[PDB]
Amino acid sequence: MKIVYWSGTGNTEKMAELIAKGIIESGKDVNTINVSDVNIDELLNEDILILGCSAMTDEVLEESEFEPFIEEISTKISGKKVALFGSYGWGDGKWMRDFEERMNGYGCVVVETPLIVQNEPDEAEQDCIEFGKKIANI
Numbered sequence: 001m002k003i004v005y006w007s008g009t010g011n012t013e014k015m016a017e018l019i020a021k022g023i024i025e026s027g028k029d030v031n032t033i034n035v036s037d038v039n040i041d042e043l044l045n046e047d048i049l050i051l052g053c054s055a056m057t058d059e060v061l062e063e064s065e066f067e068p069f070i071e072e073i074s075t076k077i078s079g080k081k082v083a084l085f086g087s088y089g090w091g092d093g094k095w096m097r098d099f100e101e102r103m104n105g106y107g108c109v110v111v112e113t114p115l116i117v118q119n120e121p122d123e124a125e126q127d128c129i130e131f132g133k134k135i136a137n138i
């Protein structure tokens, strides 16, 4: 499996590691990839796309790297299963509600409720691990 993410201070990156740990604990292999080093072709061969990005300016996906990546794969992911996650600060998850609506709009099947955690996943560590375990069972 593969987890692709963008993180500006390390919050979403930490979530990604924790989600990977859950998948591994369930007996499966998984690689975490920063959006900068992702290979679209190899990524498109995955049965489930696990994508994460923190909330950026005015509740949007990160603009210089993550958004363009989503746009590029947008026409080639109809029917694919996706699990979404990310860290946020002062908002209430608007960027994620929009990210979920967008992926659905591209024809994807959002398999679980998106996992969102405020700032660093300190108290929410187990929640991240459990999300990974749910994904491993799909």
Ligand SMILES: Cc1cc2nc3c(=O)[nH]c(=O)nc-3n(C[C@H](O)[C@H](O)[C@H](O)COP(=O)(O)O)c2cc1C
Binding pocket: 006, 007, 008, 009, 010, 011, 012, 013, 053, 054, 055, 056, 057, 058, 059, 060, 087, 088, 089, 090, 091, 092, 093, 118, 119, 120
């Ligand atoms: C430029 C900028 C804009 C932000 N905009 C939002 C926002 O609109 N809503 C929100 O809840 N958090 C916002 N945040 C806070 C981040 O989503 C939050 O700090 C998160 O934990 C960052 O995770 P990361 O280290 O994975 O990037 C913003 C942060 C930055 C740096």
